[PDB]
Amino acid sequence: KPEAVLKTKGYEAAVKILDRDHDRMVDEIIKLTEIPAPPFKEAARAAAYAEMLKDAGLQDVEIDAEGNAMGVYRGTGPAGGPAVMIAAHLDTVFPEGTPIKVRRDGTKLHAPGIGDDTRSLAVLLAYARAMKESGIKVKQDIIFVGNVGEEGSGDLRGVRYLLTKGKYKDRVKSFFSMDGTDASRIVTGGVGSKRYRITYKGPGGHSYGAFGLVNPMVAMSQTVVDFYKIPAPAKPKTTYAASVTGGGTSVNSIPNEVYMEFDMRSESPAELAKVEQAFLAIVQKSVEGENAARSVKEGPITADVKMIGDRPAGETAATQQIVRNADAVIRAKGLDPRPSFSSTDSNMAMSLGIPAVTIGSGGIGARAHSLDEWIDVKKTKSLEGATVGLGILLATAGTQ
Amino acid sequence: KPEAVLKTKGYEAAVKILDRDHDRMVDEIIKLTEIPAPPFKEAARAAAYAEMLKDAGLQDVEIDAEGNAMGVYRGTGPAGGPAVMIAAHLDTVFPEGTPIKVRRDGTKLHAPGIGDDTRSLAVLLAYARAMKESGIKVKQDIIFVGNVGEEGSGDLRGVRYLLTKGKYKDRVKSFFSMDGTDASRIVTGGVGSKRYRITYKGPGGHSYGAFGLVNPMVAMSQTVVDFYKIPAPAKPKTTYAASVTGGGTSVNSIPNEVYMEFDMRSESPAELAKVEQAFLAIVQKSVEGENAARSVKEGPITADVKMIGDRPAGETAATQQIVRNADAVIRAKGLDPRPSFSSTDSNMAMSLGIPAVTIGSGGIGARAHSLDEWIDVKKTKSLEGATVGLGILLATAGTQ
Numbered sequence: 001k002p003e004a005v006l007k008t009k010g011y012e013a014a015v016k017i018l019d020r021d022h023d024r025m026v027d028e029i030i031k032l033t034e035i036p037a038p039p040f041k042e043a044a045r046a047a048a049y050a051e052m053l054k055d056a057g058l059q060d061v062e063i064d065a066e067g068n069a070m071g072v073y074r075g076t077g078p079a080g081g082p083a084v085m086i087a088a089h090l091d092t093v094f095p096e097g098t099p100i101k102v103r104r105d106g107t108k109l110h111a112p113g114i115g116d117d118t119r120s121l122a123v124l125l126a127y128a129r130a131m132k133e134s135g136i137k138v139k140q141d142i143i144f145v146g147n148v149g150e151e152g153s154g155d156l157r158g159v160r161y162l163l164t165k166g167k168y169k170d171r172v173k174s175f176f177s178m179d180g181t182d183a184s185r186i187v188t189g190g191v192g193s194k195r196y197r198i199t200y201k202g203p204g205g206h207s208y209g210a211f212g213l214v215n216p217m218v219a220m221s222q223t224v225v226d227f228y229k230i231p232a233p234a235k236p237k238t239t240y241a242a243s244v245t246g247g248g249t250s251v252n253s254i255p256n257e258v259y260m261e262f263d264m265r266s267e268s269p270a271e272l273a274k275v276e277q278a279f280l281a282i283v284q285k286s287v288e289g290e291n292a293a294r295s296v297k298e299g300p301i302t303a304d305v306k307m308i309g310d311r312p313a314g315e316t317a318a319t320q321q322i323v324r325n326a327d328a329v330i331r332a333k334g335l336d337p338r339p340s341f342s343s344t345d346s347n348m349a350m351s352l353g354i355p356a357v358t359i360g361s362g363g364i365g366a367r368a369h370s371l372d373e374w375i376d377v378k379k380t381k382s383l384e385g386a387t388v389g390l391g392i393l394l395a396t397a398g399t400q
Numbered sequence: 401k402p403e404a405v406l407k408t409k410g411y412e413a414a415v416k417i418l419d420r421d422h423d424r425m426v427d428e429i430i431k432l433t434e435i436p437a438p439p440f441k442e443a444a445r446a447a448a449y450a451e452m453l454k455d456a457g458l459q460d461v462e463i464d465a466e467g468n469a470m471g472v473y474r475g476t477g478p479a480g481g482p483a484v485m486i487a488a489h490l491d492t493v494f495p496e497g498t499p500i501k502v503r504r505d506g507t508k509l510h511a512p513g514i515g516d517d518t519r520s521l522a523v524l525l526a527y528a529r530a531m532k533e534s535g536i537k538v539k540q541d542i543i544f545v546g547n548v549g550e551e552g553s554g555d556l557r558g559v560r561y562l563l564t565k566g567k568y569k570d571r572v573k574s575f576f577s578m579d580g581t582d583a584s585r586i587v588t589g590g591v592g593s594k595r596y597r598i599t600y601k602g603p604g605g606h607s608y609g610a611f612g613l614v615n616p617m618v619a620m621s622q623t624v625v626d627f628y629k630i631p632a633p634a635k636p637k638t639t640y641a642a643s644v645t646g647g648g649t650s651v652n653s654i655p656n657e658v659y660m661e662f663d664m665r666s667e668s669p670a671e672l673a674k675v676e677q678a679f680l681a682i683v684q685k686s687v688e689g690e691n692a693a694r695s696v697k698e699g700p701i702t703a704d705v706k707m708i709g710d711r712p713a714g715e716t717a718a719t720q721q722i723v724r725n726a727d728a729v730i731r732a733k734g735l736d737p738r739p740s741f742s743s744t745d746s747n748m749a750m751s752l753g754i755p756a757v758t759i760g761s762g763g764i765g766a767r768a769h770s771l772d773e774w775i776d777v778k779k780t781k782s783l784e785g786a787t788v789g790l791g792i793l794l795a796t797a798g799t800q
């Protein structure tokens with residue numbers, strides 16, 4: 001049984017070290033938070049995190065070609081065998097120039113990205129330190145990762161490299177992402193994203209003299225009209241939107257270039273592919289329809305299909321052992337397990353058939369993805385919450 | 401017969417002064433061209449033109465409340481009786497900051513706005529001077545006008561004030577506009593313009609979480625689609641266009657404000673009114689359709705109808721004496737009169753039932769409304785062309 005790892009002497013010893021060095025964990029949250037990591041600019045924080053991973057006594061600490069920082073907690077099994085990966089992303093949503101200095105408010109700490117996801121970075125370091133000092137022996141290797149590109153336009157570039165090209169691509173059989181502070185969350189589902197900018201081009205000309213020629217504005221408008229007739233099931237939740245538009249010079253001219261940006265989301269990879277294929281077909285039919293309705297004698301309407309966002313959809317079945325481990329540990333810790341869909345790093349592992357769950361770092365936090373982000377490092381709740389992820393991790397890797 | 405004015409000694413004497421002082425006319429083209437008059441910024445050129453109007457010996461030289469500069473060549477009839485107005489607009493299409501210095505190329509002069517319409521301003525000054533010095537007596541008063549707001553967003557604000565609010569609005573029974581250099585043109589028809597920016601507003605929200613709410617992008621798109629199914633007769637030529645669009649923040653959000661700009665033009669005021677009314681109904685129907693298809697629980701879609709352009713349509717019958725005068729004189733000068741529709745200052749007078757024709761200043765010019773604009777002030781062709789407008793003007797006012 002998974003929750004039995006909570007009654008092992010190794011875990012209880014490791015929790016005492018988390019208790020003893022909780023003051024160190026908070027210092028490392030502040031140190032890493034004040035190293036800003038905007039999207040595609042995580043190199044500075046990755047270097048600092050890499051130093052802290054080897055400071056925790058991990059093996060083979062390195063930074064891969066993508067920018068992820070890794071460390072190995074070697075298990076008792078054969079080298080190169082099945083392993084557990086647990087990651088917390090280095091990047092934040094805040095762009096370069098955002099002033100990040102931690103502000104203390106009694107037991108609260110205010111700083112952009114302090115809970116998403118910098119706290120999880122330090123909680124993983126505390127896991128590695130406490131496990132090694134207490135002499136915990138795991139059956140499978142554990143790869144502690146500070147990955148890049150989880151937020152915004154990063155589009156999971158970090159976990160994609162780890163799981164399709166990196167050293168551990170063939171060894172990760174259980175993937176964890178520690179994202180957020182809610183230690184009762186169990187993200188078992190991944191909401192996918194497909195986003196395009198369609199640029200419609202045409203010959204142009206005078207609105208009066210060249211009237212009758214094809215107008216790319218109409219083909220774009222016709223796209224939106226058919227777009228919002230695509231069936232979207234309530235469950236699995238499937239959504240879409242026409243969100244950004246632009247183009248044209250003046251009312252004196254027929255436009256020669258206009259653009260519309262589209263959003264498509266779904267909990268189901270099958271439903272997301274249905275919408276994407278219908279959207280791409282609607283784009284083609286809308287261009288053909290405009291070239292039939294008006295004159296192409298000066299050149300036809302053309303459409304440039306550019307993908308501007310891609311995140312896979314997926315799910316870990318509730319019967320998978322990794323979910324049963326997370327459910328059992330969270331129950332035994334007195335919390336209510338919250339299985340949910342979301343858009344996290346685990347989306348990548350789910351799309352590859354790898355059992356994956358996204359978990360929380362513990363304690364209290366709020367106002368993520370905003371400048372008012374803050375966490376509560378009150379020891380009783382911050383420590384007890386941080387002990388949850390360790391139990392899930394040790395139950396999954398297996399202890400001896 | 402109208403062309404008989406060309407054989408009167410007053411006209412023949414006045415033409416010799418135009419010949420003698422053609423070197424002065426060219427200097428005034430250059431001087432006035434280098435005084436930039438962007439739309440709504442004609443005050444500097446209007447002040448200089450007013451000074452040149454009194455230099456020609458005209459009466460009651462003043463600048464009205466709209467900014468037009470006018471002067472009166474008093475006729476032999478009773479004061480306050482029917483009068484002839486001849487105007488050349490001060491403004492050009494080139495915005496403030498456009499470097500305007502005349503560049504000589506033999507007999508060519510290169511400068512933005514030099515032929516449209518600065519040359520016509522100087523040609524009118526030369527008419528008044530040559531008429532006064534040769535002692536020509538006209539039966540009707542002639543109001544020489546340097547009017548404002550003929551190009552772009554001016555929307556005929558100058559002639560609109562002159563003929564609906566100014567001192568002479570009830571005395572002008574024949575209107576001329578000298579616009580362009582083609583002395584064989586006879587603009588007897590006015591193409592009307594109706595232009596709107598429709599701003600669609602909505603509640604907005606997250607594209608995923610708030611999916612199902614109304615989207616103003618869809619109402620706008622549906623408007624454009626039905627817009628291009630409006631019947632547009634080939635003759636009288638009626639056109640429309642969806643030309644400018646914008647709005648939206650990111651693919652993560654349902655837009656809360658988008659806009660589309662529409663163009664509608666016709667040679668017929670009735671056909672233009674049909675399209676405008678059908679357009680306004682399509683806008684409303686599209687808002688009602690979008691508020692029925694999706695949820696208004698956060699607020700409905702609304703549409704702000706803002707007119708951004710208005711120019712009336714009209715026509716001067718070819719049987720009108722003002723057209724017979726222009727046709728006969730242009731023939732007698734060895735040219736083929738080319739009657740045409742266009743969008744000039746005469747649109748206003750046609751709209752008010754005033755006989756109106758737009759004529760040219762003579763000579764050679766090209767590349768109007770562009771930075772490569774130039775004219776050829778080669779005396780033989782520039783003088784003979786400038787004599788055409790004088791003949792039309794004197795035949796219409798009547799000489800004694």
Ligand SMILES: [Zn+2]
Nearest residue numbers: 007008009012
């Ligand atoms: Zn015990």
Ligand SMILES: [Zn+2]
Nearest residue numbers: 020021022023
């Ligand atoms: Zn301590």
Ligand SMILES: [Zn+2]
Nearest residue numbers: 023024026027
């Ligand atoms: Zn300290």
Ligand SMILES: [Zn+2]
Nearest residue numbers: 051052053055
């Ligand atoms: Zn260190």
Ligand SMILES: [Zn+2]
Nearest residue numbers: 065066157161
């Ligand atoms: Zn890359």
Ligand SMILES: [Zn+2]
Nearest residue numbers: 038041096097
């Ligand atoms: Zn930089």
Ligand SMILES: [Zn+2]
Nearest residue numbers: 116117151369
């Ligand atoms: Zn985040």
Ligand SMILES: [Zn+2]
Nearest residue numbers: 116117179180
């Ligand atoms: Zn995060």
Ligand SMILES: [Zn+2]
Nearest residue numbers: 206208209210
């Ligand atoms: Zn044209």
Ligand SMILES: [Zn+2]
Nearest residue numbers: 250251644661
């Ligand atoms: Zn505009």
Ligand SMILES: [Zn+2]
Nearest residue numbers: 203297298299
């Ligand atoms: Zn062509």
Ligand SMILES: [Zn+2]
Nearest residue numbers: 152153309310
């Ligand atoms: Zn994305």
Ligand SMILES: [Zn+2]
Nearest residue numbers: 186327337339
């Ligand atoms: Zn559960």
Ligand SMILES: [Zn+2]
Nearest residue numbers: 335336337338
């Ligand atoms: Zn429950």
Ligand SMILES: [Zn+2]
Nearest residue numbers: 334335336337
């Ligand atoms: Zn409970």
Ligand SMILES: [Zn+2]
Nearest residue numbers: 423424426427
């Ligand atoms: Zn000189």
